[PDB]
Write a protein that binds this DNA or RNA. Structure first.
Lengths: 95, 82, 99, 107, 99, 82, 106, 92
DNA sequence: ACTTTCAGGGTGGTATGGCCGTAGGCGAGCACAAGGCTGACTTTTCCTCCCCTTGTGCTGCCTTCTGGGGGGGGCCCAGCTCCTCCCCATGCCAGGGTCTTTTCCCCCAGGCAGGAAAACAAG
DNA sequence: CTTGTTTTCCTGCCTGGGGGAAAAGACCCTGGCATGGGGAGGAGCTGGGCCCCCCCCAGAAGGCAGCACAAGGGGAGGAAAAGTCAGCCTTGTGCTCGCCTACGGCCATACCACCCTGAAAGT
């Protein structure tokens, strides 16, 4: 049987980070996987359209950030942009 | 599964849907209107699902076919894959 | 004579009960028969996954509940508490299903 | 060199490498930069943590220790921003928010 | 005494006149100033193409006309001919701009 | 253009828009309501357009920026390029 | 004997430029040979369908030129075209003349 | 330089309305229509190939994209047009 | 009308996809309770609908004055193009660290019985 | 304003079932290396967006009359809501069949890539 893949493992790690003593059901995990895939598809499509509008061939963290600003409401976009910028800074400037 | 199954969406079921929608009083003409609305909605989703199934050269409609049909109509569904 | 509740309080209790729950409010077998009957016109000798029929049913319940919320708002707009076919029609026309 | 995980390097839990692969194979552009997966995996982790925290709060309010679809739906429909983000999304077995218009209540 | 029109016939002739035309119904200079005032809270020292401001005006006017049609339907639903702010509120809520 | 330009959408202009919309009679609070609704719509569209303009590293909002901002809001606009 | 592919397919829309647009549009890794032909046939059919109705509207107003108003009239009068372009604003197109029957004098 | 479909929209107009002309405003609108439908069809065919784990957009993916996006009678004629074109294009 | 950019012709290579074979998962089909939900009838109440009337808010009209629309001119900055090149992303291969699937068992959720409390509506 | 009456919440007890941990592997991610190419940057150029000037007349604004429409009150009737009772049909269980789908293996042609040129379409 061919192996499928999902975000369940990382969803579970984030859940154990944010709520160490509460669990999650299989249906809720499936909903979480659908949500992660939906948001990934949204952001990636918006970044693709951005790079095509600007006659570019590379999707960059700049396109990802502008997609995040175009797609998420005020405070969610603010905090998501901050998280992405800090993650990229840590990735580039260390280890 | 061949004829007149729209009547299987019974008046009590429509009343329960209205109650979940917060409706307090229901006219007696609301049931046969809800049935037509539901019929149109199901036709629109199932047409796209069957189109996906036929493109995949399959004979069984899948939950992924239904999910794609719903997504194409701005009715993204969580919980059945995707 | 026995004890009887006033017309409209059991309706409020039912609203509370059905808005506290998440279960499906249409029986599964008649809905499945409706789904197969509709799919007949698009392709004969079709098969369905139980998950496909379940996804269709969940989508239909969500759609109908939201439409009933908008219908209730139109009824309250017309200074009524009884929802009527014209309220469903106004809701659908505004959200863009009737044009 | 001992293979070091890019998610660990970035500080995330989400799969930076799998996100890069999905970006490359998704037909979004000719090329994908090195910071694009790291940024997308941070955004997807933040948006996961937000919903999970709100749904854990909703589960605790109901005296449950296991998140079920009802808790995610309550979190989304009670958060103003998440409701806007997921306004066209149906949660299976999630129910609706408790809400009765004042006009229908008894006098 | 002179001749005057009854209230409503001039309204209908204005409807007939403005439903046959395509020209923009808002003055271009005060619309441009409004657009530049709104953009000032997003970025200072913004330049605007004339076609960009024209596109914004056409979009805004089409949006307002389409909204006024729904507002009129909501007003008629309540057995009225006059449109009120609650009709606009109901139309926008059912559309999804107010939820 | 600094302050209080919403009043430039005059009551005659709002009446013209309502007339094109088929409205026969207009209450007096409709003008303020319409000014607020238009302000919200414009804020949304111009925020999206300025996002595109800033991503393109430009200082000028183009008609294409507005067309993209309108497309991603579900309101496609023909006649200004694209 | 270097015939064009549009002439090979019998079309007036550019099969070659449609093929290039499909190849450089990041739609898939490969583009088949009949895909641009099919796409350019569909686009030509739709353009002809809209232009026929727009010209009919122009002749209805004793005008020899198609204008955005005529395109709007064609689209909004045709039921299938109205459904297809249901979320599209035609610049300088206006609206259909439509008055609710309750607003007319009795 | 810039390209468009003006040369081909004009050659289509002179086939359905040989006398009627077109404004530069109406022509520019017809160019946004063609580009908007192309991106609609190509985007749906792109997803159709991805769902089926294919890497090629063929006439089958364009035919299914057309039947998903166009309404009832528009799709029956658009598909008949595309099928007739490929049949004549492949057969010499 | 000139042109200059791009679509077509010919050839090489391989990789995607089509075809045959195969096995099992799951979808369809048939019994069989039985009991919980549905359908139907009855009461009656309360909500909708119609009619009337008042006054208030909207429209129609007229006059004054402002400011939007239309040229006219200057200017300077911002968007676009071009040429360098260098740093980044791509392609490929080897090897292990991560993630997927299977197994299981124990705690969290579901069912039930019994009691207490909380609104409801009659008087 | 009391008292009886359904309905729901709470708590203890029993139970089951599904989720969280453990283990083997398989599969893709990371490291290392070579390499073409895209985009960042330094100029240069000019198109257009801004800004000011003048004029004028068309449209906005304010006021006034008057009327017609929105709204509130009152009454009648008819149509839902609630309750009860008989039936039926959903559903949960169990057993069977075989069809379809997904994987494997092989290979064939269809598409990419590249080198040239002529013609199509853009100005």
């Amino acid at each position: 049987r061919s192996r499928k893949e999902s975000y369940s493992v990382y969803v579970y790690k984030v859940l154990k980070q944010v709520h160490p003593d509460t669990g999650i059901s299989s249906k809720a995990m499936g909903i979480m996987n659908s949500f992660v895939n939906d948001i990934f598809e949204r952001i990636a499509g918006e970044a693709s359209r951005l790079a095509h509008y600007n006659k570019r061939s590379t999707i960059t963290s700049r396109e990802i950030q502008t997609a995040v600003r175009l797609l998420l409401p005020g405070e969610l976009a603010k905090h998501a942009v901050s998280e992405g910028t800090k993650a990229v800074t840590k990735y580039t400037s260390s280890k | 599964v061949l004829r007149d199954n729209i009547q299987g969406i019974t008046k009590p079921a429509i009343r329960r849907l209205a109650r979940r929608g917060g409706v307090k009083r229901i006219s007696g003409l609301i049931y046969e209107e809800t049935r037509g609305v539901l019929k149109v909605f199901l036709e629109n989703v199932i047409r796209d699902a069957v189109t996906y199934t036929e493109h995949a050269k399959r004979k069984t409609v899948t939950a992924m076919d239904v999910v794609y049909a719903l997504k194409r109509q701005g009715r993204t569904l969580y919980g059945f894959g995707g | 004579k026995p004890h009887r509740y006033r017309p409209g309080t059991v309706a409020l209790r039912e609203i509370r009960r059905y808005q506290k729950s998440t279960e499906l409010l249409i029986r599964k077998l008649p809905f499945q028969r409706l789904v197969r009957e509709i799919a007949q016109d698009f392709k004969t000798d079709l098969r369905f996954q139980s998950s496909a029929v379940m996804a269709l049913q969940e989508a239909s319940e969500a759609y109908l509940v939201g439409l009933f919320e908008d219908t209730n708002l139109c009824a309250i707009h017309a200074k009524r508490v009884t929802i009527m076919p014209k309220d469903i029609q106004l809701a659908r026309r505004i959200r863009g299903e009737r044009a | 060199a001992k293979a070091k995980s890019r998610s660990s390097r970035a500080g995330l839990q989400f799969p930076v490498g799998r996100v890069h692969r999905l970006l490359r194979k998704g037909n979004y552009a000719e090329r994908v930069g090195a910071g694009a997966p790291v940024y997308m995996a941070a955004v997807l982790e933040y948006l996961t943590a937000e919903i999970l925290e709100l749904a854990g709060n909703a589960a605790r309010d109901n005296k449950k220790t296991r998140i079920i679809p009802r808790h995610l739906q309550l979190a989304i429909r009670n958060d103003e921003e998440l409701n806007k983000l997921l306004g066209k999304v149906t949660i299976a077995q999630g129910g609706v928010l408790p809400n009765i218009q004042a006009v229908l209540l008894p006098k």
